[PDB]
Short mmCIF file of C-alpha atoms and ligand atoms in Angstrom, two decimals:
data_model
loop_
_atom_site.label_atom_id
_atom_site.label_comp_id
_atom_site.label_asym_id
_atom_site.label_seq_id
_atom_site.Cartn_x
_atom_site.Cartn_y
_atom_site.Cartn_z
CA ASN A 2 -12.52 30.28 1.98
CA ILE A 3 -14.54 27.32 2.39
CA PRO A 4 -15.71 25.68 5.46
CA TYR A 5 -13.56 22.01 7.16
CA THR A 6 -15.82 19.49 8.31
CA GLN A 7 -14.21 17.26 11.62
CA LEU A 8 -15.49 13.74 11.12
CA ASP A 9 -16.15 10.78 13.53
CA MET A 10 -15.38 12.91 16.56
CA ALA A 11 -16.67 9.87 18.60
CA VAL A 12 -14.52 7.08 17.61
CA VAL A 13 -12.66 5.53 20.24
CA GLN A 14 -11.42 1.75 19.82
CA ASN A 15 -13.61 -1.47 21.19
CA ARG A 16 -10.73 -3.83 21.21
CA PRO A 17 -11.60 -7.35 23.13
CA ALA A 18 -10.74 -7.45 27.13
CA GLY A 19 -7.15 -8.74 27.44
CA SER A 20 -6.42 -8.05 23.53
CA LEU A 21 -3.07 -8.17 22.66
CA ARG A 22 -1.05 -5.04 20.90
CA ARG A 23 -2.48 -4.69 17.19
CA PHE A 24 0.25 -3.55 14.79
CA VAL A 25 -0.94 -2.40 11.74
CA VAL A 26 1.27 -1.62 8.39
CA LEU A 27 0.10 -0.30 4.92
CA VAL A 28 2.48 -0.01 2.35
CA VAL A 29 1.37 2.24 0.00
CA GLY A 30 2.94 1.05 -3.75
CA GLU A 31 3.75 3.60 -6.42
CA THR A 32 3.02 2.70 -10.21
CA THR A 33 3.32 -0.99 -9.69
CA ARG A 34 0.36 -2.88 -11.63
CA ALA A 35 -1.86 -5.83 -11.64
CA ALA A 36 -0.77 -7.21 -14.91
CA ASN A 37 2.96 -7.82 -14.00
CA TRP A 38 2.34 -9.30 -10.27
CA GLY A 39 3.05 -13.12 -10.37
CA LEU A 40 0.67 -13.89 -7.57
CA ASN A 41 -1.80 -12.63 -10.34
CA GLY A 42 -0.87 -15.33 -12.96
CA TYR A 43 1.63 -13.23 -15.03
CA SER A 44 3.89 -15.29 -17.19
CA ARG A 45 6.98 -14.12 -15.17
CA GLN A 46 7.23 -14.71 -11.04
CA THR A 47 7.95 -11.15 -9.97
CA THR A 48 6.80 -11.94 -6.74
CA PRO A 49 8.65 -14.97 -5.94
CA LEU A 50 8.99 -14.03 -2.14
CA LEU A 51 5.06 -13.61 -1.10
CA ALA A 52 4.20 -16.44 -3.69
CA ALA A 53 6.95 -19.24 -1.42
CA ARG A 54 4.75 -17.79 1.45
CA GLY A 55 2.11 -19.76 0.00
CA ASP A 56 -1.92 -19.20 2.16
CA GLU A 57 -0.01 -16.59 4.57
CA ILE A 58 -0.41 -14.20 2.10
CA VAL A 59 -4.02 -13.13 0.87
CA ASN A 60 -3.48 -11.95 -2.76
CA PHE A 61 -6.71 -9.94 -4.45
CA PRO A 62 -6.74 -10.31 -8.30
CA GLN A 63 -9.36 -7.58 -9.16
CA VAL A 64 -8.46 -4.63 -7.36
CA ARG A 65 -9.10 -0.99 -9.54
CA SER A 66 -7.36 2.30 -8.68
CA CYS A 67 -9.07 5.73 -7.46
CA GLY A 68 -7.29 7.38 -9.64
CA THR A 69 -4.07 6.89 -12.30
CA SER A 70 -1.88 9.54 -10.44
CA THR A 71 -0.52 9.73 -7.26
CA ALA A 72 -2.34 12.90 -6.16
CA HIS A 73 -5.50 11.89 -7.28
CA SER A 74 -5.38 8.65 -5.69
CA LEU A 75 -3.49 9.44 -2.35
CA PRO A 76 -6.01 11.69 -0.80
CA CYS A 77 -8.76 9.59 -2.57
CA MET A 78 -8.33 5.88 -0.93
CA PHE A 79 -7.46 7.82 2.55
CA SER A 80 -10.88 9.54 2.33
CA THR A 81 -14.33 9.29 3.00
CA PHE A 82 -15.42 9.72 -0.87
CA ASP A 83 -15.26 6.76 -3.10
CA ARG A 84 -14.09 7.43 -6.81
CA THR A 85 -17.28 8.32 -8.58
CA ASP A 86 -17.74 10.54 -5.58
CA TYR A 87 -14.31 12.46 -5.08
CA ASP A 88 -13.93 15.87 -4.82
CA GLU A 89 -10.41 17.02 -4.07
CA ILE A 90 -11.63 20.24 -2.71
CA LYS A 91 -14.52 18.55 -0.95
CA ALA A 92 -11.56 15.85 0.41
CA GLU A 93 -9.46 18.34 1.43
CA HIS A 94 -11.30 20.21 3.54
CA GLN A 95 -12.38 17.15 5.98
CA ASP A 96 -10.54 14.68 8.34
CA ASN A 97 -9.02 11.81 6.41
CA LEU A 98 -8.76 8.46 7.66
CA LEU A 99 -5.39 8.62 9.58
CA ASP A 100 -6.75 11.94 11.36
CA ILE A 101 -9.73 9.75 12.24
CA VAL A 102 -7.51 7.05 13.34
CA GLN A 103 -5.29 8.92 15.13
CA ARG A 104 -8.52 10.67 17.07
CA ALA A 105 -9.52 6.96 18.02
CA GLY A 106 -6.18 7.19 20.37
CA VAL A 107 -4.34 5.09 17.93
CA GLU A 108 -0.65 5.58 16.85
CA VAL A 109 0.32 6.67 13.74
CA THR A 110 3.30 7.44 11.93
CA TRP A 111 3.72 8.55 8.28
CA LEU A 112 6.94 7.10 6.78
CA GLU A 113 7.81 8.98 3.21
CA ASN A 114 9.54 8.12 0.31
CA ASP A 115 7.52 8.78 -2.64
CA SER A 116 8.43 12.50 -2.78
CA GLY A 117 5.61 13.48 -0.65
CA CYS A 118 1.90 12.72 1.11
CA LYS A 119 -0.07 14.93 -0.80
CA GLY A 120 -1.51 16.43 2.08
CA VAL A 121 -2.81 13.46 4.05
CA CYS A 122 -0.13 12.82 6.55
CA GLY A 123 0.32 16.33 7.79
CA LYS A 124 -1.68 16.29 10.90
CA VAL A 125 0.25 12.62 11.77
CA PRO A 126 3.85 12.12 13.12
CA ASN A 127 5.31 11.91 9.81
CA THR A 128 8.92 11.51 8.47
CA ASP A 129 10.29 11.89 5.07
CA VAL A 130 13.31 9.22 4.71
CA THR A 131 14.64 10.33 1.16
CA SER A 132 16.51 13.15 2.26
CA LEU A 133 18.90 11.20 4.29
CA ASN A 134 20.86 10.11 0.82
CA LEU A 135 22.44 6.86 2.49
CA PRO A 136 24.88 5.87 -0.33
CA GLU A 137 23.48 2.31 0.12
CA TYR A 138 19.99 3.32 -0.85
CA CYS A 139 20.02 6.65 -2.68
CA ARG A 140 21.06 8.20 -5.93
CA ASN A 141 19.94 11.58 -7.37
CA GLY A 142 17.28 12.43 -4.82
CA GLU A 143 15.40 9.22 -4.85
CA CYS A 144 16.11 5.86 -2.69
CA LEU A 145 15.66 2.45 -2.98
CA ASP A 146 12.61 1.82 -0.67
CA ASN A 147 14.70 -0.48 1.97
CA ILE A 148 16.03 2.64 3.33
CA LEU A 149 12.23 2.47 4.87
CA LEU A 150 13.37 -0.83 7.09
CA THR A 151 15.67 1.69 8.61
CA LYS A 152 13.47 3.91 10.66
CA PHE A 153 10.91 0.45 11.08
CA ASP A 154 12.50 -0.52 14.92
CA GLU A 155 11.89 2.99 15.94
CA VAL A 156 8.11 3.07 15.19
CA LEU A 157 7.51 -0.48 16.38
CA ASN A 158 9.08 0.03 19.95
CA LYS A 159 8.32 3.71 20.45
CA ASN A 160 5.41 2.21 22.81
CA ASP A 161 2.63 -0.26 23.26
CA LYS A 162 -0.44 1.42 21.66
CA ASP A 163 -1.81 -0.04 19.34
CA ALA A 164 -0.52 1.55 15.59
CA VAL A 165 -1.07 2.34 11.95
CA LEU A 166 2.42 2.65 10.29
CA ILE A 167 2.32 3.83 6.64
CA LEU A 168 5.06 2.90 4.25
CA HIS A 169 4.77 5.50 1.40
CA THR A 170 7.13 3.85 -1.18
CA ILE A 171 8.66 4.68 -4.76
CA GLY A 172 7.98 1.20 -5.78
CA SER A 173 7.63 0.89 -9.58
CA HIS A 174 7.91 4.86 -10.69
CA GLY A 175 9.40 5.39 -13.80
CA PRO A 176 10.58 6.31 -15.97
CA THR A 177 14.22 5.97 -14.27
CA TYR A 178 12.80 2.54 -13.48
CA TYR A 179 16.24 0.88 -13.27
CA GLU A 180 16.94 2.82 -9.69
CA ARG A 181 14.11 1.04 -8.33
CA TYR A 182 15.89 -2.41 -7.52
CA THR A 183 19.43 -3.58 -7.00
CA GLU A 184 21.65 -6.58 -8.78
CA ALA A 185 19.60 -9.03 -6.77
CA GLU A 186 16.17 -8.14 -8.10
CA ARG A 187 17.97 -7.68 -11.97
CA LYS A 188 16.46 -11.19 -12.97
CA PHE A 189 14.80 -10.03 -16.12
CA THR A 190 17.13 -8.29 -19.09
CA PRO A 191 18.60 -6.63 -20.81
CA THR A 192 17.09 -3.36 -19.34
CA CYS A 193 16.78 -0.19 -19.67
CA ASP A 194 19.08 1.69 -17.66
CA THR A 195 18.45 5.36 -18.58
CA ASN A 196 15.70 7.89 -17.82
CA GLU A 197 15.63 8.39 -21.49
CA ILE A 198 13.04 5.40 -22.06
CA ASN A 199 11.95 6.39 -25.49
CA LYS A 200 16.07 5.16 -26.40
CA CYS A 201 14.74 2.01 -25.39
CA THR A 202 12.74 -0.87 -26.66
CA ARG A 203 9.75 -1.87 -25.40
CA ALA A 204 10.89 -5.64 -24.40
CA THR A 205 13.67 -3.80 -22.64
CA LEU A 206 11.60 -1.26 -20.95
CA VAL A 207 8.81 -4.29 -19.44
CA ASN A 208 12.34 -6.37 -18.72
CA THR A 209 13.20 -3.20 -16.41
CA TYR A 210 9.83 -2.51 -14.69
CA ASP A 211 9.53 -6.32 -14.03
CA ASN A 212 12.91 -5.79 -12.15
CA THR A 213 11.10 -2.87 -9.81
CA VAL A 214 8.35 -5.65 -9.10
CA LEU A 215 10.81 -8.00 -7.66
CA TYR A 216 11.87 -5.19 -5.63
CA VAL A 217 8.16 -4.27 -4.44
CA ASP A 218 8.02 -8.13 -3.49
CA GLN A 219 11.05 -8.43 -1.11
CA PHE A 220 10.58 -5.20 0.42
CA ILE A 221 6.52 -6.22 1.69
CA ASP A 222 8.70 -9.52 2.65
CA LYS A 223 10.99 -7.81 4.38
CA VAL A 224 8.54 -5.78 6.20
CA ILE A 225 6.44 -9.39 7.14
CA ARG A 226 10.19 -10.29 8.40
CA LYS A 227 9.95 -7.57 11.14
CA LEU A 228 6.63 -8.85 12.36
CA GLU A 229 6.13 -12.38 11.81
CA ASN A 230 8.13 -13.81 14.62
CA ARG A 231 6.56 -11.34 17.47
CA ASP A 232 4.11 -13.68 19.03
CA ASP A 233 3.04 -11.02 21.59
CA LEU A 234 1.57 -8.96 18.41
CA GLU A 235 -1.21 -9.42 16.22
CA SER A 236 0.50 -7.82 13.22
CA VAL A 237 -1.23 -7.17 9.72
CA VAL A 238 0.73 -6.00 6.48
CA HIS A 239 -1.66 -4.48 4.16
CA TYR A 240 0.10 -3.76 0.31
CA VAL A 241 -2.08 -1.61 -2.47
CA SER A 242 -0.55 0.25 -5.51
CA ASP A 243 -1.44 4.08 -6.03
CA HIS A 244 -2.17 3.06 -9.75
CA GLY A 245 -0.69 1.35 -12.61
CA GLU A 246 1.82 1.84 -15.47
CA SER A 247 1.64 2.35 -19.12
CA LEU A 248 4.48 0.26 -20.91
CA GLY A 249 4.28 1.26 -24.57
CA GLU A 250 1.04 -0.42 -24.98
CA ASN A 251 -0.55 1.19 -27.98
CA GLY A 252 2.62 3.79 -27.92
CA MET A 253 1.26 4.75 -23.93
CA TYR A 254 3.79 5.29 -21.56
CA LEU A 255 4.00 6.16 -17.70
CA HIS A 256 0.35 7.08 -15.91
CA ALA A 257 -1.78 9.77 -15.51
CA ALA A 258 -3.88 9.07 -18.34
CA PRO A 259 -7.90 10.27 -18.02
CA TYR A 260 -9.74 7.54 -15.72
CA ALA A 261 -12.44 6.78 -18.03
CA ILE A 262 -10.27 6.01 -21.22
CA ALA A 263 -7.20 4.89 -19.17
CA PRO A 264 -6.01 1.21 -20.32
CA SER A 265 -6.53 -1.47 -17.87
CA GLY A 266 -2.63 -1.38 -17.17
CA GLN A 267 -2.98 2.09 -15.39
CA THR A 268 -6.11 0.88 -13.12
CA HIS A 269 -6.11 -2.44 -12.12
CA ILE A 270 -3.83 -2.68 -9.49
CA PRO A 271 -2.20 -5.23 -7.27
CA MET A 272 -3.42 -5.55 -3.43
CA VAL A 273 -2.25 -8.13 -0.53
CA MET A 274 -2.67 -8.81 3.05
CA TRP A 275 -0.27 -10.98 5.18
CA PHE A 276 -1.83 -11.80 9.25
CA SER A 277 0.75 -12.67 12.02
CA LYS A 278 0.08 -15.79 13.77
CA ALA A 279 -1.76 -13.65 17.01
CA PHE A 280 -4.03 -12.12 14.36
CA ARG A 281 -5.09 -15.34 12.98
CA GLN A 282 -5.69 -16.93 16.64
CA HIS A 283 -7.32 -13.90 17.81
CA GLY A 284 -8.90 -11.57 15.60
CA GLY A 285 -12.14 -13.11 14.53
CA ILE A 286 -11.23 -13.75 10.75
CA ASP A 287 -12.80 -16.44 8.88
CA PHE A 288 -9.69 -16.81 6.56
CA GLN A 289 -11.12 -19.68 3.84
CA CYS A 290 -14.10 -16.79 3.90
CA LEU A 291 -11.65 -14.09 2.87
CA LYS A 292 -9.39 -16.06 0.57
CA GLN A 293 -12.80 -16.81 -1.52
CA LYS A 294 -13.81 -13.86 -1.22
CA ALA A 295 -10.25 -12.32 -2.72
CA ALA A 296 -10.28 -14.53 -5.76
CA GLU A 297 -13.80 -14.16 -6.82
CA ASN A 298 -14.79 -10.60 -5.74
CA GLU A 299 -13.85 -6.97 -7.28
CA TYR A 300 -12.49 -4.73 -4.93
CA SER A 301 -10.81 -0.90 -4.82
CA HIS A 302 -9.04 2.03 -3.04
CA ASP A 303 -13.26 2.49 -2.16
CA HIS A 304 -12.47 0.01 0.21
CA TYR A 305 -9.83 1.24 2.03
CA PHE A 306 -11.25 3.44 4.12
CA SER A 307 -13.56 1.19 5.77
CA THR A 308 -11.31 -1.98 6.00
CA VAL A 309 -8.31 0.27 7.88
CA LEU A 310 -10.99 1.43 10.69
CA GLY A 311 -12.28 -2.47 10.52
CA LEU A 312 -8.56 -3.58 11.39
CA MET A 313 -8.36 -1.38 14.49
CA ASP A 314 -11.70 -2.12 15.82
CA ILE A 315 -13.05 1.52 15.68
CA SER A 316 -16.32 1.73 16.61
CA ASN A 317 -18.65 4.71 17.46
CA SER A 318 -17.57 5.89 13.56
CA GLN A 319 -20.42 7.40 11.22
CA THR A 320 -17.91 6.99 8.26
CA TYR A 321 -17.55 3.56 8.66
CA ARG A 322 -19.56 1.54 5.85
CA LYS A 323 -19.23 -2.43 6.98
CA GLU A 324 -20.19 -3.12 3.21
CA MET A 325 -17.12 -1.61 2.23
CA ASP A 326 -14.75 -2.93 4.80
CA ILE A 327 -13.35 -5.98 2.95
CA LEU A 328 -12.82 -8.09 6.25
CA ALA A 329 -16.16 -7.91 7.86
CA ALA A 330 -17.53 -10.36 5.20
CA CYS A 331 -15.35 -12.92 7.14
CA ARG A 332 -15.25 -11.00 10.70
CA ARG A 333 -17.09 -13.39 13.37
CA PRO A 334 -19.72 -12.23 15.63
ZN1 ZN B 401 -9.57 26.28 1.34
ZN1 ZN B 402 4.01 9.94 -10.93
ZN1 ZN B 403 2.06 7.37 -7.96
#
């Protein structure tokens, strides 16, 4: 019974003349938390493939989520609203980040493997891959995230337009944490190989969760592998989780704790970025500047909206905020 507000009706892309195609992948993580992320100095190396890439990967050790649950964080991070002003009803009744990006002429595709896109993806091309139920990847109606990679090349090769591809993963979601990885990532043992996580010790729970992080690491790595040798493409891979998780600290499990009293495990989330050779050469970013800002500054889901607009060279936007675009402070005139 309330009015919908279309936003940013003037947007266009303003790519430099003669530009290469720009292809951006937004990996939307799930449940993975900052405190168990190798690149953040966690005592275990849960991110070996990203770590081995050294400064090719920009890591952000101080990032906070908008919510402690998926249905809160996803619409909030894709909305113009910052956490402190976010309102579910207001956000549902206006254009979101992807509606605006698509209007600007960018090819947006959403690939879903996490039980639903929470109303964010309906107006752009979207496919839920979980129903494929491939025996290689899937059991009990959930699938290992690598299933998303089976549909990646089709999006990459669809046409020559600049693109934003969202890969919405199941990541570290519990209580079936054991389903989130394979034998190749089962490095921390013993494990809790049941949904009844109360029947496991919290040490074995942490082990199992850390193995899920190894799978996140290899997933991001495989996405980078699809793009890093495409010298004719300016590609960016951005990863951020939706929220963290509690692993029995003070008797707290799972997530969705009320934001104000939520433990740091649920609000402090990992975020990384990777940039292709052509992007680094032509994209205008000062990478030493960026490395320093990533290390020193606190960021949040609030930065997501304008960072993504900035990655597509979207001009004539009223919703864009240069101060909330992570890269703008390091972007050359
Ligand atoms: Zn309504
Ligand atoms: Zn959940
Ligand atoms: Zn979630």
